[PDB]
Amino acid sequence: SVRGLAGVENVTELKKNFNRHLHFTLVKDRNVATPRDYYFALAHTVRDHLVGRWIRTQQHYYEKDPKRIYYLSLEFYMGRTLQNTMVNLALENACDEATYQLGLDMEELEEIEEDAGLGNGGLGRLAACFLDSMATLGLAAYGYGIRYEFGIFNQKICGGWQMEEADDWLRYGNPWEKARPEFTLPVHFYGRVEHTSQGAKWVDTQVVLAMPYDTPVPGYRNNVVNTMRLWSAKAPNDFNLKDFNVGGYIQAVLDRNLAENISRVLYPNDNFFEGKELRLKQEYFVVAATLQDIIRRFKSSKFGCRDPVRTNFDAFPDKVAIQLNDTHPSLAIPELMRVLVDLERLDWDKAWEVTVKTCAYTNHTVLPEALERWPVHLLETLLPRHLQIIYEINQRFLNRVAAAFPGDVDRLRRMSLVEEGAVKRINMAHLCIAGSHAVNGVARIHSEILKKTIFKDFYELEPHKFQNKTNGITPRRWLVLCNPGLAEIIAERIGEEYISDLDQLRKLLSYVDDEAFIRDVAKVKQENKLKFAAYLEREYKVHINPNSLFDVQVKRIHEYKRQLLNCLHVITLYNRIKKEPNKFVVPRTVMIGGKAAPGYHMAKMIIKLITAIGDVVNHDPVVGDRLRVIFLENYRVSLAEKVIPAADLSEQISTAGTEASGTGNMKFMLNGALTIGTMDGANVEMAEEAGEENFFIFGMRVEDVDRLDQRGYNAQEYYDRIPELRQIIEQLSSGFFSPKQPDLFKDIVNMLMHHDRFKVFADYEEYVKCQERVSALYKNPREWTRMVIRNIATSGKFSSDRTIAQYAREIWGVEPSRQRLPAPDEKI
Amino acid sequence: SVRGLAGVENVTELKKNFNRHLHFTLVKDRNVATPRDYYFALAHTVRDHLVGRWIRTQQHYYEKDPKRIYYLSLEFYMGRTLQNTMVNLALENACDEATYQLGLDMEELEEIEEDAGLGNGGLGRLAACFLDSMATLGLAAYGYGIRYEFGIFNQKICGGWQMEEADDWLRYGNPWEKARPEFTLPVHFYGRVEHTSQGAKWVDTQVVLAMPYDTPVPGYRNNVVNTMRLWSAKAPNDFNLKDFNVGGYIQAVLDRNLAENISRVLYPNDNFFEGKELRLKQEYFVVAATLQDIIRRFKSSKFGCRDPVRTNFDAFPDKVAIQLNDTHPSLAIPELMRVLVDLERLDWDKAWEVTVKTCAYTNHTVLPEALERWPVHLLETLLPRHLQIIYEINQRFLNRVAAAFPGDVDRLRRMSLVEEGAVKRINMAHLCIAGSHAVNGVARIHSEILKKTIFKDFYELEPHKFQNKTNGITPRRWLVLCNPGLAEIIAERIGEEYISDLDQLRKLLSYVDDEAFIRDVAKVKQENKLKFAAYLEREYKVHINPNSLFDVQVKRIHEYKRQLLNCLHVITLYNRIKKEPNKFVVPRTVMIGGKAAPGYHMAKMIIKLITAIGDVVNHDPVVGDRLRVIFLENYRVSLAEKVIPAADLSEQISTAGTEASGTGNMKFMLNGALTIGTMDGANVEMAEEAGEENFFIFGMRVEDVDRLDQRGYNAQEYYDRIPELRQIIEQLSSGFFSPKQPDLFKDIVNMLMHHDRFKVFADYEEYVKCQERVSALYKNPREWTRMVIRNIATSGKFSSDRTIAQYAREIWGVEPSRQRLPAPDEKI
Ligand SMILES: O=P(O)(O)OC[C@H]1O[C@H](O)[C@H](O)[C@@H](O)[C@@H]1O
Ligand SMILES: O=P(O)(O)OC[C@H]1O[C@H](O)[C@H](O)[C@@H](O)[C@@H]1O
Ligand SMILES: *Cc1c(COP(=O)(O)O)cnc(C)c1O
Ligand SMILES: *Cc1c(COP(=O)(O)O)cnc(C)c1O
Structure with a gap:
């Protein structure tokens, strides 16, 4: 089959590393090696073949300095990674002859791999398919999310009823990820805002650390391997124990599990909104850490070498593009506003220019109970600064509306990012249309439905923002x-x-x-x-x-x-x-x-x-x-x-x-x-x-x-x-x-x-x-x-190669490349 | 220095794998590799050199079938593992020329390693020194404990006062361990005892799973690498969620942290006893899992091939020897009684013969507040079966006393494994002297103090049990x-x-x-x-x-x-x-x-x-x-x-x-x-x-x-x-x-x-x-x-080579071997 050359030299080559890995990484002998031991040796022999391409692709974006694209999703429904990687590197026929010879059957070892079920259904899978097509189409793209310990549950039927069971998926290891502790960043929660002079300050906050783990994303047969970076929650060593914190030593060590619970379980709600505080914590944590690493790659990259003006964010929508996969990372919008205004000391109006030209939002459904409307009280507590920035944004936005639609009072209250009556809430889709330069729907009928029915007000103020990019x-x-x-x-x-x-x-x-x-x-x-x-x-x-x-x-x-x-x-x-x-x-x-x-x-x-x-x-x-x-x-x-x-x-x-x-x-x-x-x-x-x-x-x-x-x-x-x-x-x-x-x-x-x-x-x-x-x-x-x-x-x-080629061209402003980069590695 | 040959071929050999590991395991280039990246490549190049010896030593005990020795300690205060491994394999001079050439300085990379502080002080270190001497003296020994996530705290002085901080030691990985999921075992807690006919049954118990992780223990320059097996706590997938358990999905997934808290933190009490339930949980969990794996190695080993009688535990004190490092695994004694009587259907008196000839206890202090005396109520709840077995053992033991010391009522109450008055408690040192064939003290004066003062009653009933083995x-x-x-x-x-x-x-x-x-x-x-x-x-x-x-x-x-x-x-x-x-x-x-x-x-x-x-x-x-x-x-x-x-x-x-x-x-x-x-x-x-x-x-x-x-x-x-x-x-x-x-x-x-x-x-x-x-x-x-x-x-x-040679000979019944096994591996 169209499953690659099955040569003589390369079967010998694979037969040989499957064997070193059995001895050196698994530290087992043939006589006592387990099926999972077997799958782990082959999963390491296959990943040694893309390691030269990932190093080579990531250094090359650092040479070239392309506009990078960041796809942010609380969901990446990847499925298993081994066969997909052999497909894309054209290795499936030779891993199948080489394991055959070793006396194994590669399809039984494939089945031993556990699924990356870090998605719920539909939008989960689309982020996974996009990532594949961005690597194929040679885009300098990065997928960003949460490394959940527990993905979507496993469903058992018992007496005809569903039974959910912990998707314990990292139970036995993950050979596909690479932890990167040097890139660990802090995420602040709670605290208060003090207005000190040459700034509003967000002060006495709880810190939770974010640890990245990189997974390879190989493009189809082209020598491009992009990264999926997933953040883990980690308690700070000191503060859980320390202030003048009597409570008990063993309990302050055990209460660190409270802070690490941010990346613990995917919410299993497909097209539904549960205003749980822990869900707003997962949404702020993926966003805060991700914006920090975007800016680390921008300020460095060929801006820390030639550096002048006072290092400037004017270049920023031309070197960076971020995509919001539904309203779930909408916090990106007031978080980029916080960093630029509060930390970089930018002017409001300069920073609002940069945010909108950087952000774009994809609407996924029209079902009202799925729409996110967070209580101002949650925001209050958890994110003091972001609720002020949302009220200022609201404020100026509904002054552009009044100005265009004089006296049309009903409209103003229809466009408000803050909804009144009884439990004041913020409509996160209105935030995303406002702080974004492109809102798209995912099928031409859903995108008509939008500009006709739900976002008709928004479409009348800014028709120029509304796009369609049919899924794939x-x-x-x-x-x-x-x-x-x-x-x-x-x-x-x-x-x-x-x-x-x-x-x-x-x-x-x-x-x-x-x-x-x-x-x-x-x-x-x-x-x-x-x-x-x-x-x-x-x-x-x-x-x-x-x-x-x-x-x-x-x-x-x-x-x-x-x-x-x-x-x-x-x-x-x-x-x-x-x-x-x-x-x-x-x-x-x-x-x-x-x-x-x-x-x-x-x-x-x-x-x-x-x-x-x-x-x-x-x-x-x-x-x-x-x-x-x-x-x-x-x-x-x-x-x-x-x-x-x-x-x-x-x-x-x-x-x-x-x-x-x-x-x-x-x-x-x-x-x-x-x-x-x-x-x-x-x-x-x-x-x-x-x-x-x-x-x-x-x-x-x-x-x-x-x-x-x-x-x-x-x-x-x-x-x-x-x-x-x-x-x-x-x-x-x-x-x-x-x-x-x-x-x-x-x-x-x-x-x-x-x-x-x-x-x-x-x-x-x-x-x-x-x-x-x-x-x-x-x-x-x-x-x-x-x-x-x-x-x-x-x-x-x-x-999804057409979907992504249309996204690149009319939302992100980059050109696809079909052609081969010349990785892998070197016999230096 | 007496730090090995620093040859030409072997520096080339090490320079070359330090480089593959940088590329393949760390997936980094020289241009962007971190100091910790560096230490990780060298820690993997050094451990590839003992992998052939560990496989070869463990298969060889399976060929030979020696009496195996199990040292059980809730403490192994190992310190760092890299230099110690190069010492013992004679590699320190060549890892130092090879890193020198690569432009590094091995002493700065050594310092990047985190300590295995899985011990408190004294008895912690002695288990670590013994392990070294058992491998050197070619003993088929196994060290068993708890894999703590958090070892002993890190001490900061602030204003002249101590500050304790989480010893987060596996934060960045551990290259020295090897997880072994095929050997995962269940540990039962709580439940109740039903007396059903051809057995007392321990029923409706909570299960917590024990996951082993093996670390190599190289003997000094002799090609022997023994194992330290450390158990981790893991919640069962299903039951934390499932029974007709409404409470909430996300909370039942998050409450799994309660069950995994068994292996989370070392108790930081050096020579002190805190009757915390969670401490008795760590003591039962290391013991229950360890006795299961002892019996898996016995029933198999050259007993599952020739197998007859109804497979017999009469051979058991001649193929197995377990050492109790203080009273902390005393539960081993009623747990081996539970398994043999309740599960193997052995007679009481046959199983009491086998337990005493298998167990030996080492007393470490004479300070009373350090002595473990657990409330019968804790045992009640947590371990229903073990409290019955302790009362039967007590029972027959104080009938051997009455018989030897007629009418000496005070003595009986002095020897009781159960202490009266106000919060009935079990004296765990009396349990250990009773179910054990050798009690030793750790310095000739401490061992006189014992037979003169604290255990004089015990010494008068059984003088034959009291030994001294001075530490080393x-x-x-x-x-x-x-x-x-x-x-x-x-x-x-x-x-x-x-x-x-x-x-x-x-x-x-x-x-x-x-x-x-x-x-x-x-x-x-x-x-x-x-x-x-x-x-x-x-x-x-x-x-x-x-x-x-x-x-x-x-x-x-x-x-x-x-x-x-x-x-x-x-x-x-x-x-x-x-x-x-x-x-x-x-x-x-x-x-x-x-x-x-x-x-x-x-x-x-x-x-x-x-x-x-x-x-x-x-x-x-x-x-x-x-x-x-x-x-x-x-x-x-x-x-x-x-x-x-x-x-x-x-x-x-x-x-x-x-x-x-x-x-x-x-x-x-x-x-x-x-x-x-x-x-x-x-x-x-x-x-x-x-x-x-x-x-x-x-x-x-x-x-x-x-x-x-x-x-x-x-x-x-x-x-x-x-x-x-x-x-x-x-x-x-x-x-x-x-x-x-x-x-x-x-x-x-x-x-x-x-x-x-x-x-x-x-x-x-x-x-x-x-x-x-x-x-x-x-x-x-x-x-x-x-x-x-x-x-x-x-x-x-x-x-410790004399300490262990004296233990082997007058308590464990095995002979030391100074000589070389001929490992490593094979160019097959
Ligand atoms: O783009 P960065 O975040 O700076 O990381 C750059 C890359 O360095 C090496 O190639 C690693 O293999 C990659 O895992 C990492 O993705
Ligand atoms: O003695 P067992 O528990 O059966 O395990 C036997 C051994 O198999 C292989 O050599 C592994 O490297 C060791 O890690 C393991 O210790
Ligand atoms: C592709 C896919 C979906 C999307 O399915 P629809 O029928 O479009 O809702 C959902 N779940 C899984 C696992 C899928 O692979
Ligand atoms: C050896 C050692 C001990 C034992 O010390 P003593 O002075 O005998 O109490 C305690 N702690 C550490 C870290 C040691 O290395």
């Missing part, structure tokens, strides 16, 4: 790494230039009718389906049938994602088979997977429904092998990499206007699944790219949702209008699916009948008819595969 | 590593066989009168004094005079160590100079150093006295350079290694019968200091070995202390008997030394005048006269050095 996925991890079959049969016809130039994929349109190509595309899918059906019984159990249509919905459990509509379809299909059980039905394995947040009760109740329908469906002897309903336990990056290559049908069913982009959708179109969905997020651009006919769009447009809300959504109407729907709601209310526990789902019933914000019933007729059309196509294998070929040949636009 | 120090670290000058001028006359055969040192008696030898021995001391006087002003400041007598007392601050008597001598000497300031006085730099425990108030008040006398003395223009009084900040293993080579006079002044052995005394006699002291601990054996005349013994014998206690110690008598003493007590009461704060030392005064358990005043006349004799000798440099030569030629008996 990375062809490396999401095709070459998880589906090498498909990438080989594509490169066999059209070459390998496409993994770094994905619109090339359009050339597969000349083969849409090619008989050997139609047969390769379907085989690969049968093989990918056949591998995952096995793994399913080796790792868990049920027994699925690889000759079914694999119908999969995998994403976080939310009401707006409408996992309940796919559930209503599955009870409809079971009830149909039980009424006419001797008629042919195209058989299907329905897989639903995703994690609910701790205490999102409806979401946790929806996992209970899915496994309660599967207990019933999966043991009906009349249903036999026609319908299997499976919930996919502990869905993560490495699991998305096994089931997305085996999927036939992709459920993408949000109520229109709630899903800002989706990216799950793009991964499935790359890998050969057909999509069923609503005209929402990036599903609108995907269908436009594939052609509407090669797609299954159904249901309400964002237009119709609205027309229904103005009249008033009434579920009762659907219930007594459709008998198939009315039958399913009394099977739930009568205890058909919880037959010892009849009140069990009366909760799901009631919000459906009376409190549905997402209009599950209103799109049900249409979805069940559209799904009937899916199956009629599956019945004819040649036409299913030529539709599949027109979706795969058309996913070039959903590469 | 290790010639490698305490001469060759800290004083290479002295070791070179000795080996030049008498060869290098002595570093592994120290009684050879007796051959320096033929050179006592040798004129070049008398001049080498004094030069080396002037150079060692001259180096430390420099370091003193580079690292801190005062300015000392290298032509003074360096009078040093360095050990933990305790009342029984009589730091206050050396203070009374120094105020006497100042007052003498101020009265006749124009008479000649042999000038001296008095150095006192040591740490006080947190909240040992008298001890912390004694540091305040020392620095208050030094503020006064050190700025008297009449005193000039005649007396300098210095307190030595943060005294530890690496600091003992700089000041013991520069000392002329060694204060060893405990009130007789309190210091069980001392070892500080032996280090100073190896390094050329004369000793002043009382006839106490191992100072009695030292003077007998050097000859009484070559020594400065003074004061009360243990005989006289007693005769005084029977009459009743009255300080008032000394006070109005000696005017020099009466003058000093009113200078303290009048506020002479705290001249803004006169009541400051009225605390020290009052316990001296009214509550002194250690009879400071009673040995004052004699000490001041003996000290006058010290100075009269210093006045004549040839006779000082020939006395020094008769103490150095006579310290062969105070090697």
